[PDB]
Design a protein around this ligand. Structure first.
Ligand SMILES: [Cl-]
Lengths: 593, 452, 455
């Protein structure tokens, strides 16, 4: 000790270079440990250790900090608090509650060195004990639940590392700090609360991964039909600026059939986070009467917030997703944008004076991205229940100039099976969503095709294949029109263009801000595509029976206009869509006569 | 005060035997000849501080020079008396005006608005420019840039918006903050003379940074401007419009400073943190829940080689909420301003249009005018490649529409202010060219009421 | 006596420095005993004076320097081999992953192996019928060859690799292949595709698997293919088996090499890849072939994705200078529905001459292969011209070639991932396509073959 007494080890700052701080006398601290840096006590993480000198990645601004100031390690890795009080909250990158942040500091602006618990440790929750005393338990087992919202049960699980028999447990009103259960372990008696901590850089353990083979219903026609993602799948959304990336991801958040959405604003616009908190509570489910905000967790670290905290926000989010996955839920995790996460890594790599890899990004960029996406997936969770859960990852990428050959997009496409390439020329043409249907792909299409054929008892996969064949042929025909002019094409090729045109603007094009067009059910999608394809089929036969292309178009003005309105037909009047098929058959046969 | 300068290597200087020195702390070098230069701590290690001097290290004798550590980062002394005054890049008076007495001094980096405290951009700002107010509406709290090029009249457009911009039904609470970045003396003189001649100076604060000013001063300039804007907006309750040009000179200065520190260059040689750096400027725009006032930004930039994928317009577009595009094709046609509405966009325009803000027919006519103009331009290009006989009778009408749209609507002159009412009425005149049956984006209630 | 020091000096990413050591050797296997009792293996990259620099396969997350120890095992990294490895699944470091028994090893082998004496080598010339025409005829695989698949993200290289392993056989023999499969940084779903195929066909009972997935530590990937090849050469040269080695994705191996090279601040080569990338890849791919007097063999099918689909990238470029040809998949053929989407023009086999012809395949093999290549290159050129300048812009003969190249892609190359063609079926089909061309155009084939086979 010193001067007659002794306490804990106190590091001393010896260097400050932006978000990188070096501190000596840190021998008791471990790699990945969280520490409080400087007089202000800003949140930092130990990433390297040379003798007793720690290299620290700081998640707040370091302006105004210098050598000689103290550093205090917490002895624990970067972690999240996991318990009741987490749903419907807006956190920053390191899981600090932003509304509470504002109330405590009494400021509209972000200060530094503010220590806040992630959850409300004073709030009373009703714990409903569901397990019996004398029961042998291990990690993942449910001991009880909390109705955190009217729909979502917050299942209280035995934490990883705990194993034994339940000694005492009873229902009642507790905070997340009160002991609700006593476990008799081999290492003695351990008491559990409703909250557990978990290090964000370590994926939460599972029994085993499963094939993600059930398609997600986003209600977005271009996605569900041609480039579908499955529950437990991963999808990259790389696009240039101004291509509608935020509208697309918001559509998926509000309409997808998942139990919970984790939305991560990583290095992007503050107004888009403001849009979410304003809009999500207003989006009310007709069935349950719950808002989208009542099943959403928001993590925000905007472009002008601390750069290192961009990386933090990514791991904070996926770890919360894994937590709810472990309960047996289907979770969507939206990362917008993963490009800004990579930029953070590049900034720190420079401060550390590392050898740059592709485009100045560190050499471990690829493996970091791979490790992140491998944490998504459908799983059997731990617990005697052997319950199933999933995490579906939707990630925006922002490649400079829209050029997807850059490292972030390329390394992502190495490990994800779905690519929704956004297009600037489509966005200018008011074609929304701006997904390039020629460049995009989904490696789940074949498996989803089988699932759809089975659940619909229709030849859906053949219809999807035919629809894409037509679009691909359209691209070939459009090159010819560019060179010779459209008047040089045969009647058969003129028809293909019109059918492709119908697919493009009657099906692919979808208005997110139209009350009916904003969501299209699986059943409605089938009827719409069937009708579009039927017109082409009947018109094709008309041509082979001696009818001319011009005659077919002139005599089918009314029915083609009806096909183009089918997207606005209410979900309870889908008979109005299917009946178009007969009208097509009638009018065209009349034209032949 | 330390007399312990140890090393000078280029614009970089190492000072030893120091204590209590912080990252980004401002320093002051008293040269052996009494000359004073300011600097900034780039890095601090044990007893050493690495500093960069704004004006350079030429002529400095190490042993006979001293360094004072000021104990604060770069700051602006703010007051409401800044209105009508002209300052340089570092906030020093440039107009030979009276003494400026600051209410307080503010870190020019400002603070980050809590995302939960942030208020979505809302309400109309009338620029007086039809192509903007109607089709690409500027909203209070929005960042809406102008993408231009060398030889294009962005400086005339900047000065026009600066003097014409206003909020309706709200008197004596609007201000313009004008930041000139790395521009020549003569273009600075253009702006100064125009503001004074029109009287725009009386509601403006001006920060004028020149091409031959230190590169560090050039990058401090927009932060001085935005610090003044936030003070006027959030502390005085004003609606403040911030116009800054040329953002391309800003990025060049940033690259020059980056190279001096021998940092690893990113795409096209610009710093790897170019996006982040631009964001720390552009995200200062917005509104705050519970506060009167707003900061709105119009960054103006020249696209190198007219290339929109160049890092400067590209990263800007990833940050801003739309963009106003000037083109040479329209400039060569004498269209003033030469705004091309086809690639131009305002993302937040919905929050500043409609009844009570502009007029009830705003959105419908905008959708229709944009759609008709795109079809008109498409028909025009068809006549070019295949001839006039390749167009139908309707295609000919749309082609003629696109001509009058450019010649009469978009083209208004650089000294002509159109009220939103005049803009909307003029839009109905052009729409009347088309058959009523072709106005499919407008419902019958609006057609019956307004269509001339 | 176990050598262990509690003197860890620094921990930086995948690298660690230990001081005050003695008797430590270059490439010696180490084990880090962490403060919580966890064990992580590593490898000595450098020794000087009383210091040692080590790379940690499982990373250094959570390590406390003061309270951890480093054990030096007195030998380099080894694999405990046994024929009991057959039908077993291991991880990237050769530890059981399938909840089955621990192997009682027959012996332990340095996973670096040894170089086969060139004079001891037997030249590979035994035709392997894959059933895939684009391979069997034009890019012939022989037993003991190393013939990789060059692909890209989103392309069906796993489908092709599985089909080859499924259908491959030599003729006039009931020899089978023991399969050694190495997963290197691939995803669960990629790995599971192979596991499911191996289980359905029952090939899993003929297989040894070493699995490093995308969630597994990256530096572990440097050891994994050496593990797999040590198992392969053991089964082949000590247990007399014919071994087929499939390793994917080799790009993930090179990326791991670059991570270590960057961490060591070594002088970088192209794209940040170390100067020794060629040599390093060669130490893997040259571990294939046959040995005089020995019954077994090692055939390699490495798989790599070309970054940005760029064949001139260091990874496929250097691999191409080492391997005995390459099979290239393209996005263009894939999008046209070609299965497998093999582009035969940039593809190659360097061992096709002595593995084909009379008494091996058929006497018309080499002639038809050359004529098909020539006709396809000319036809592909004509198609591309006609699609831009019009079908009437081609000469009368080029118009024939344009149609040939189309039928060639659609009927010859495109056969399906579950279609197994005999070499005779492949050669006869080739003749049907050559019959589209005028006999005067068939200049690569002599009159004796034309008179005999040409319809
Ligand atoms: Cl954007």
């Amino acid at each position: 000790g010193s001067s007659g007494s002794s306490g804990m080890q106190i590091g001393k700052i010896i260097k400050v270079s932006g978000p990188l701080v070096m501190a000596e006398n840190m021998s008791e601290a471990s790699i990945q440990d969280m520490c409080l840096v400087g007089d202000l006590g800003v949140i930092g993480e130990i990433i390297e250790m040379r003798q007793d000198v720690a290299s620290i990645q700081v998640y707040e601004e370091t302006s105004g900090i210098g050598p000689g100031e103290p550093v205090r390690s917490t002895g624990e890795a970067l972690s999240v608090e996991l318990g009741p009080g987490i749903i419907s909250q807006m956190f920053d990158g390191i899981q600090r509650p932003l509304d509470t942040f504002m109330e405590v500091t009494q400021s509209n602006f972000l200060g530094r060195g503010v220590q806040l618990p992630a959850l409300d440790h004073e709030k009373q929750w009703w714990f409903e004990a569901t397990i019996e005393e004398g029961t042998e338990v291990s990690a993942g087992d449910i001991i009880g639940y909390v109705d955190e919202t009217k729909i979502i049960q917050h299942k209280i699980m035995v934490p990883n590392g705990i194993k034994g028999t339940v000694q005492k447990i009873e229902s009642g009103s507790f905070t997340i700090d009160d002991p609700i259960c006593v476990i008799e372990t081999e290492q003695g008696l351990k008491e559990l609360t409703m909250m557990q901590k978990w290090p964000v850089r370590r994926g939460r353990p599972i029994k085993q991964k499963l094939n993600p083979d059930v398609p997600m219903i986003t209600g977005q026609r271009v996605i569900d039909t041609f480039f579908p993602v499955t529950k437990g799948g991963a999808a990259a959304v790389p696009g240039p600026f101004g291509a509608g990336k935020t509208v697309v991801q918001h559509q998926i958040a509000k309409w997808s059939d998942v139990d919970l959405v984790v939305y991560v604003g990583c290095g992007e616009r503050g107004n888009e986070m403001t849009d979410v908190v304003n809009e999500f509570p207003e989006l009310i489910d007709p069935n349950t009467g719950e808002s989208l905000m009542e099943r959403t967790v928001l993590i925000a670290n905007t472009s002008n917030m601390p750069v290192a905290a961009r990386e933090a926000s990514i791991y904070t989010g996926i770890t919360i997703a894994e937590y709810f996955r472990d309960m047996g839920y289907d979770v969507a995790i939206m990362a917008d944008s993963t490009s800004r996460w990579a930029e953070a890594l590049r900034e720190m790599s420079g401060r550390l004076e590392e050898m740059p890899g592709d485009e100045g990004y560190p050499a471990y960029l690829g493996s970091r991205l791979a490790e992140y996406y491998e944490r998504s997936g459908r799983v059997i969770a731990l617990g005697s229940d052997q319950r199933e859960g999933s995490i579906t990852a939707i990630s925006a990428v922002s490649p400079s100039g829209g050029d997807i050959s850059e490292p972030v997009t390329q390394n992502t496409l190495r490990v994800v099976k779905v690519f929704w390439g956004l297009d600037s020329s489509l966005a200018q043409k008011r074609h929304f969503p701006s997904i390039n249907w020629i460049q995009s792909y989904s490696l789940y299409s074949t498996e989803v095709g089988r699932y759809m054929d089975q659940i619909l008892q229709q030849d859906w996969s053949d219809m999807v294949t035919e629809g894409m064949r037509i679009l691909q042929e359209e691209e070939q025909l459009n090159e010819i029109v560019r060179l010779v002019g459209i008047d040089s094409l045969s009647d058969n090729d003129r028809l293909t263009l019109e059918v492709a045109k119908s697919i493009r603007e009657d099906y692919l094009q979808q208005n997110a801000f139209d009350d009916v067009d904003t969501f299209t059910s699986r059943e409605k999608q089938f009827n719409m595509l069937k009708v579009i394809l039927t017109f082409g089929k009947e018109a094709r036969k008309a041509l082979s029976l001696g009818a001319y292309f011009n005659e077919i178009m002139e005599g089918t003005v009314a029915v083609r206009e009806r096909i183009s309105r089918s997207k606005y037909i209410p979900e309870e009047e889908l008979a109005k869509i299917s009946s178009i098929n007969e009208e097509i058959k009638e009018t065209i046969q009349l034209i032949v006569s | 005060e330390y007399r312990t300068i140890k090393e000078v290597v280029g614009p970089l200087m190492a000072v030893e035997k120091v204590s209590g020195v912080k990252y980004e702390e401002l320093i002051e070098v008293r040269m052996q000849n009494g000359e004073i230069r300011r600097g900034q701590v780039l890095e601090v290690q044990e007893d050493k501080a690495m500093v960069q001097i704004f004006e350079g290290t030429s002529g400095i004798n190490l042993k006979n020079s001293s360094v004072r550590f000021l104990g604060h980062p770069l700051q602006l002394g703010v007051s409401e008396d800044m209105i009508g005054r002209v300052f340089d890049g570092l906030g020093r008076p440039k107009d030979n005006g009276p003494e400026i007495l600051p209410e307080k001094y503010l870190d020019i980096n400002g603070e980050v608005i809590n995302p939960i405290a942030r208020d979505y951009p809302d309400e109309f700002i009338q620029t007086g420019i039809s192509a903007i107010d109607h089709l690409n509406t500027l909203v209070r709290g929005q960042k809406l840039p102008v993408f231009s090029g060398s030889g294009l009249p962005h400086k005339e457009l900047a000065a026009q918006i600066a003097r014409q911009a206003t909020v309706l039904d709200s008197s004596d609470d609007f201000a313009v903050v004008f930041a000139a970045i790395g521009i020549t003396f003569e273009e600075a003189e253009f702006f100064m003379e125009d503001f004074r001649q029109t009287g725009a100076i009386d509601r403006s604060v001006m920060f004028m940074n020149l091409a031959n000013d230190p590169a560090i001063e050039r990058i401090a300039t927009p932060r001085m401007a935005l610090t003044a804007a936030e003070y006027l907006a959030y502390e005085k309750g004003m609606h403040v419009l911030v116009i800054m040009t040329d953002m391309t000179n800003y990025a060049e200065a940033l690259r020059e400073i980056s190279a001096a520190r021998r940092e690893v260059p990113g795409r096209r040689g610009y710093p790897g943190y170019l996006y982040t750096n631009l964001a720390t400027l552009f995200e200062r725009a917005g509104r705050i829940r519970g506060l009167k006032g707003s900061v709105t930004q119009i960054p103006i930039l020249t696209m190198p080689e007219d290339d929109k994928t160049h890092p400067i317009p590209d990263l800007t577009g990833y940050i801003t909420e739309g963009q106003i595009i000037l083109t040479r094709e329209l400039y060569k046609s004498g269209i003033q301003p030469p705004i091309d509405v086809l690639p131009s966009l305002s993302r937040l325009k919905d929050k500043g249009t409609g009844a009570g803000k502009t007029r009830e027919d705003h959105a419908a006519t905008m959708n229709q005018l944009f759609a008709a103009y795109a079809q008109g331009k498409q028909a025009k290009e068809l006549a070019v490649v295949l001839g006039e006989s390749a167009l139908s009778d309707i295609d000919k009408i749309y082609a003629k529409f696109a001509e009058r749209f450019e010649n009469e609507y978009v083209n208004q002159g650089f000294y002509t202010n159109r009220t939103i009412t005049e803009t909307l009425d003029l839009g109905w005149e052009l729409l009347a060219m088309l058959p009523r049956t072709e106005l499919k984006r407008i419902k019958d209630d609006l057609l019956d009421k307004y269509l001339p």
